[PDB]
Amino acid sequence: FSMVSVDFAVPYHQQQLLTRETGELYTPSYRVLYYFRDMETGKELQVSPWHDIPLYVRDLVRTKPASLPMNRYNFICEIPKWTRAKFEIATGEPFNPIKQDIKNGVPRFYKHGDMMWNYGALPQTWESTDVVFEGGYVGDNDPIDAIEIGMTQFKVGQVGAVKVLGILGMIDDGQMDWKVICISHNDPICRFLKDIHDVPKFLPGCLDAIHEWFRVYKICQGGVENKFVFNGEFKDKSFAMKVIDESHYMWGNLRKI
């Protein structure tokens, strides 16, 4: 038996993402915490869903065609499909757990209707205010926002691999607020969706509905319609993956500080 092998020692231990809840759901004390459980040792450590969860999903040895491009990102669901309690990552609290946003002293919920798709953020991203985006707007100092459009509803704070399909430039309170469009790698049609122009072929009405909702959800809370760069048009996954890297880079610098 030839044993000639490239002694490529697998370093680190794989980690298992865990979440825990504390506080009373729908009240201001609710929090979803994240932890890593070493898969060899069993040791747990609290981690930050934002800084510590890989933006890029990778395994040790990639067996897919070197010619096939990569498109597997992690996605942190904040507002599950068919719900309206506005939850968010507490970028201010240690270990950035998920908390429900407070509008007054009262926990916030959308007045317009429900979030009809899983809504959240991509970890290890930062849309900086010191950067200027299309139409000359600056970032809103928050992780990049994502909308995963498959049939299955994620639990609050649930994380999973998605395939980026496109992006929408929404202006929010004077700043750039990209909404990345993506789909769970486990959804039945994930494979038939190659780029943003396929969303209407397989989920007719989905993109119009996403556009319309973000365009007007504030109006009924008193506000005004919202503005979009590119004409409320959805840019494709190439443009979207670029914005995400600019984003990952920006996150990298915030951490070097």
Q: Which of residues 7-46 bind a copy of itself (CB under 8 A)?
A: 8-12, 14-18, 36-37, 39, 45-46
The type of residue at 128 is S
In terms of phi and psi (left: phi > 0; alpha: psi -120 to 50; beta: otherwise), the region of 185 is: alpha
Query: Among residues 80 and 169, whose Cβ is nearest to a copy of itself?
Result: 80
For a copy of itself, the closer of residues 206 and 239 by Cβ is 206
Could you identify the residue written with the tokens 């096939």? Answer: 68
The residues, any chain, with a CB within 8 Å of residue 131's CB and separated by 6 or more, are: 138, 139, 246, 250
Q: Which of 40, 42, 58, 105 binds a copy of itself (CB under 8 A)?
A: 58
Q: How crowded is residue 158: how many other Cβ atoms within 10 Å of its Cβ?
A: 17
Q: Which of 33, 47, 164, 240 binds a copy of itself (CB under 8 A)?
A: 47
Q: Which residue number, 83 or 218, has a Cβ lying nearer to a copy of itself?
A: 83
Any contact of residue 112 with a copy of itself (CB under 8 A)? yes
CB of 240 to a copy of itself, least distance (A): 21
CB 45, min distance to a copy of itself, A: 5
Q: How far apart are CA 217 and CA 99, in angstroms?
A: 21
Instruction: Using CB under 8 A, pick the residue from 92, 105, 136, 222 that binds a copy of itself.
Output: 92
Contacts of 185 (CB under 8 A, 6+ apart): 72, 160, 161, 162, 163
* Residue 177, beta-bridge partner list: 170
The residue from 30, 31, 73, 81 that contacts a copy of itself (CB under 8 A) is 81
The reply, when asked if residue 208 is annotated as ligand binding, is: no
* Cα dihedral 193/196/199/200 (nearest 10): -140
Q: Does 105 bind a copy of itself (CB under 8 A)?
A: no
Among 131, 138, 171, 203, binds a copy of itself (CB under 8 A): 203
Q: What minimum distance in Å lies between the beta carbon of 135 and a copy of itself?
A: 21
Residue that has been written with the tokens 């996403």 in this structure: 210
**Residue whose CB is less far from a copy of itself, 18 or 132:** 18
- Strands (DSSP E) contained in 69-210 are 73-79, 87-89, 98-100, 118-121, 132-133, 137-138, 145-148, 159-172, 175-184
Q: Tell me: is residue 145 an annotated ligand-binding position.
A: yes
Residue 64 assigned to a binding site: yes
Q: Measured from the CB of residue 228, what is the shortest distance to a copy of itself in angstroms? A: 18
Nearest to a copy of itself of 6, 231 (CB atom) = 6
Q: Which of residues 126-155 bind a copy of itself (CB under 8 A)?
A: 141, 150-153
Phi first, then psi: give them for residue 85, nearest 5 degrees: -75, 120
Specify binding-site residues for Mg(2+). 140, 145, 177
Specify binding-site residues for (R)-malate. 62, 64, 71-72, 185
